Amino acid sequence: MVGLIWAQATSGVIGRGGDIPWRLPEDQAHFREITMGHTIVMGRRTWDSLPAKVRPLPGRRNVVLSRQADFMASGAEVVGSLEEALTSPETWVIGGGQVYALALPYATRCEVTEVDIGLPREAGDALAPVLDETWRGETGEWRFSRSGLRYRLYSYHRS
Numbered sequence: 235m236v237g238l239i240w241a242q243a244t245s246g247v248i249g250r251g252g253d254i255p256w257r258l259p260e261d262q263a264h265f266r267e268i269t270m271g272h273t274i275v276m277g278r279r280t281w282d283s284l285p286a287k288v289r290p291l292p293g294r295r296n297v298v299l300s301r302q303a304d305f306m307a308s309g310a311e312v313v314g315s316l317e318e319a320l321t322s323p324e325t326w327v328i329g330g331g332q333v334y335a336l337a338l339p340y341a342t343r344c345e346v347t348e349v350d351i352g353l354p355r356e357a358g359d360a361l362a363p364v365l366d367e368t369w370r371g372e373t374g375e376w377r378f379s380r381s382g383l384r385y386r387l388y389s390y391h392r393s
């Protein structure tokens with residue numbers, strides 16, 4: 235089971251300036267519950283985006299993808315191809331835009347949070363992958379976050 239997990243604005247934006255341009259604490263709790271115990275795979279920019287206090291993410295096998303042969307990630311395995319990163323019964327690809335694009339052909343599930351903010355796509359933004367017809371989705375109810383934002387969860391699958 236290779237899965238992808240991300241949160242996006244309706245427009246598809248997931249990242250900007252090395253950060254996520256919103257906060258949604260219920261989504262972090264959801265992210266932790268889905269990924270905990272498993273292997274997590276991330277691009278080097280996403281690893282750099284985690285504050286040192288939170289990296290590696292606890293209780294998970296952290297794997298970082300870089301083309302730098304000598305890249306060091308204290309607390310994580312570093313691999314040179316996505317295919318080398320995928321492990322064991324369950325791996326979650328946790329970002330960012332480049333690594334989601336690379337991992338989608340190997341993915342069976344996507345767990346997606348849609349954040350209802352009118353955040354327009356800007357040049358240089360990291361974007362979520364677009365899911366074609368092979369994906370089947372189940373739509374959750376809209377909810378309101380402690381942060382003030384409206385959001386809903388999608389669970390996508392394919393066989």
Ligand SMILES: NC(=O)c1ccc[n+]([C@@H]2O[C@H](COP(=O)([O-])OP(=O)(O)OC[C@H]3O[C@@H](n4cnc5c(N)ncnc54)[C@H](OP(=O)(O)O)[C@@H]3O)[C@@H](O)[C@H]2O)c1
Nearest residue numbers: 240241249252253277278279280300301329330331332333
């Ligand atoms: N759910 C979310 O909303 C969410 C989740 C995670 C991240 N983000 C955001 O996403 C943004 C970062 O996404 P990104 O797309 O800019 O960078 P990224 O995908 O996180 O990492 C990009 C890096 O991965 C490595 N890489 C890419 N293709 C590779 C390949 N084929 N083989 C080996 N290594 C490869 C390179 O690292 P080297 O340059 O070291 O070779 C490349 O610079 C940030 O803003 C972050 O906050 C959002």
Ligand SMILES: O=C(O)c1cccc(CN2CCCCC2)c1
Nearest residue numbers: 262265266267288291292328329
């Ligand atoms: O699971 C956790 O414990 C945790 C800790 C810090 C942040 C997050 C949310 N995500 C994680 C991967 C993309 C960047 C932001 C989760």
Ligand SMILES: [Co+2]
Nearest residue numbers: 268269270271
């Ligand atoms: Co699990």
Ligand SMILES: [Co+2]
Nearest residue numbers: 342391392393
């Ligand atoms: Co299945």
